[PDB]
């Protein structure tokens, strides 16, 4: 049949239709091709198609041979063996000529036939199939998993014409396979109603078919084992298991620990650069974000300024990278990436140059994009002694900052640092188009608002803190504020406020 | 550059073809023919 689902296979409707259109169209057509090969990853049904094609055509029973079985120690027996194998159709061709049936030969694991002895055996088969006497009643189907280890000569035209392929099933194919292998369960009512096949099809990814069957078998096994007690002497529910109903829990368990996939996946870490969100502890944050939005719209709309850059400056422990990430996510450009020194530990200068070049090469392809670079001074490692740093990465940056992208494309660049004077000394402060400033907490009112937003000290403690602080100014970074709060939250309720004030005084300084 | 140290080899033999019994069979058959001719 041409249904492709009656015989117990799914996921390759188009390939089956191609097989029908290309291979056997001539035979069906009112009154040829003599080479077929199959190759695909392990799993997805190949032997099934072999057996089905064996019983499909109104042809004689196919012969099944092995891969490494055509051999023998005594020179002479292998040649006689192949001769015996191929002797079947000779008599039929002799006695019936053109008006003869079709012969199907199945070679299993043919990859072991091509590699001295292997040369002669491949030559014998090669001559027999495509030699002086052309037989139009012989068809050979071979299958492998590693086509790389096959000879080119075996694949020339006139010998192996049709070269199909198999592939990992899609969601529809997985649903078809699950239907096929749960048909019996549904027919005998042994499957519970709470199970939802759509959820399983959505959840499972790239199981290549065989793993789906394994998962179904594992779920059956666990549902079967729930109704058996073994220790002293094996015993089973007997009658009570006659109503054994599988549950969603079994398909859950069989998926999370066993029946794992044979392939991998990827991971993302974009959540690591914001851990406490953003709180409006003061006016300047809104100003910074509004300026970022203006820059984003400027890069989006302009036509004769394709490249735009900005610099974020602020004393240490002032959350510059957090604002950089937030402004990056606000724009919602198609392509966004963050180049940070955390990945590159122990690298030389050349590796850093290559990494930056790769990131920018990726960024150039898309239409419009934005890139952010954080902690420049650590990227081109800097030490006040000497000073000392790298002169290759610096030039790479100074060149990449004023290189226009391909025609009709847009790139935005943001940079964050905490040492502006040094950058102005190296002359890199000229490249950037404009700069923005990130301040520190200055007035006690902003501090009190910050504590109120954090919600860690109550009205009495807050009043005491206000009395002790309103007559003073402050200079503190938000990250350090969180650290100090955590440090002072470790004492008993009696010493918390006094400890916090003591720590603030100890770290208390002026700009 | 890196020059390969050299190499080492492994072997795998194959069955021999004595084909010496057929000679004895042929000699015996010729004797058969001689005796058969004499008997007539």
């Amino acid at each position: 049949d041409w249904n492709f689902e009656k015989m117990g296979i799914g996921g390759l409707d188009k390939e089956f239709s191609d097989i029908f259109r290309r291979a056997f169209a001539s035979r069906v057509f009112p009154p040829h091709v003599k080479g077929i090969l199959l190759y695909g990853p392990p799993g997805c049904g190949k032997t099934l198609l072999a057996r089905q094609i064996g019983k499909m055509l109104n042809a004689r029973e196919p012969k099944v041979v092995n891969g490494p079985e055509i051999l023998n120690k005594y020179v002479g027996e292998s040649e006689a063996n192949i001769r015996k194998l191929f002797a079947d159709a000779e008599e039929e061709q002799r006695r019936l000529g053109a008006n003869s049936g079709l012969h199907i030969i199945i070679f299993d694991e043919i990859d072991a036939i091509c590699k001295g002895v292997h040369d002669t055996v491949v030559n014998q088969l090669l001559s027999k199939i495509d030699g002086v006497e052309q037989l139009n009643n012989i068809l050979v189907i071979g299958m492998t998993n590693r086509p790389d280890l096959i000879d080119e000569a075996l694949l020339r035209p006139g010998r192996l014409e049709v070269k199909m392929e198999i592939g990992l099933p899609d969601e529809k194919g997985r649903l078809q396979i699950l239907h096929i292998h749960t048909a019996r369960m549904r027919g005998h009512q042994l499957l519970s109603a709470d199970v939802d096949i759509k959820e399983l099809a959505v959840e499972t990814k790239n199981f290549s078919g065989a793993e789906l069957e394994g998962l179904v078998r594992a779920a059956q096994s666990t549902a079967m084992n729930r109704h058996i007690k073994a220790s002293t002497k094996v015993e089973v529910d007997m009658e009570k298991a006659e109503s054994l109903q599988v549950t969603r829990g079994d398909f859950l368990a069989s998926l999370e620990n066993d029946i794992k996939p044979a392939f991998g996946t990827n991971q993302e870490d974009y959540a690591s650069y914001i851990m406490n969100g953003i709180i409006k502890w003061g006016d300047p944050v809104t100003r910074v974000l509004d300026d970022g939005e203006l820059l984003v719209q400027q890069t989006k709309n302009s036509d004769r300024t394709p490249l735009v850059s900005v610099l974020l400056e602020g004393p240490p422990h002032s959350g510059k990278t957090a604002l950089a990430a937030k402004i990056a996510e606000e724009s919602n450009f198609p392509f966004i990436k963050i180049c940070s020194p955390d990945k590159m530990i122990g690298f030389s200068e050349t590796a850093k140059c290559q990494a930056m070049k790769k990131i920018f090469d990726d960024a150039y392809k898309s239409q419009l994009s934005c890139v952010v670079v954080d902690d420049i001074e650590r990227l081109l490692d800097y030490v006040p002694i000497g000073p000392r740093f790298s002169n290759l990465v610096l030039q790479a940056l100074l060149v990449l900052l004023k290189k226009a992208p391909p025609q009709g494309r847009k790139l935005l660049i943001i940079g964050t640092t905490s040492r502006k004077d040094v950058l102005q000394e190296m002359e890199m402060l000229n490249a950037f188009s404009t700069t923005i400033h990130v301040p520190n907490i200055a007035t006690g009112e902003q501090l009190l608002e910050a504590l109120e937003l954090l919600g860690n000290f109550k009205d009495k403690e807050r009043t005491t803190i206000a009395q002790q602080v309103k007559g003073k100014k402050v200079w503190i970074g938000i990250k350090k504020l969180l650290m100090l709060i955590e440090m002072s939250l470790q004492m008993d309720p009696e010493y918390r406020v006094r400890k916090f004030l003591a720590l603030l005084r100890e770290e208390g300084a002026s700009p | 550059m890196a020059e390969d140290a050299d190499m080492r080899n492994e072997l795998e033999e194959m069955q021999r073809r004595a084909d010496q019994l057929a000679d004895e069979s042929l000699e015996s058959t010729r004797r058969m023919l001689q005796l058969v001719e004499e008997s007539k």
């Binding site: 023998n72 120690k73 005594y74 002479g76 027996e77 | 069955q15 004595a18 019994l21 057929a22 004895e24 069979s25 015996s28 058959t29 004797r31 058969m32 005796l35 058969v36 004499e38 008997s39």
Partner: peptide, 27 residues
């Protein structure tokens, strides 16, 4: 295989038996 060699040996044993038979006939 060694099966072929054994088959040849049995062939030749039968030939020797025929040799003895024909020698007896001539005698």
């Amino acid at each position: 295989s060694k099966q072929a060699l054994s088959e040849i040996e049995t062939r030749h044993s039968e030939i020797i038996k025929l040799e003895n038979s024909i020698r007896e006939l001539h005698d």
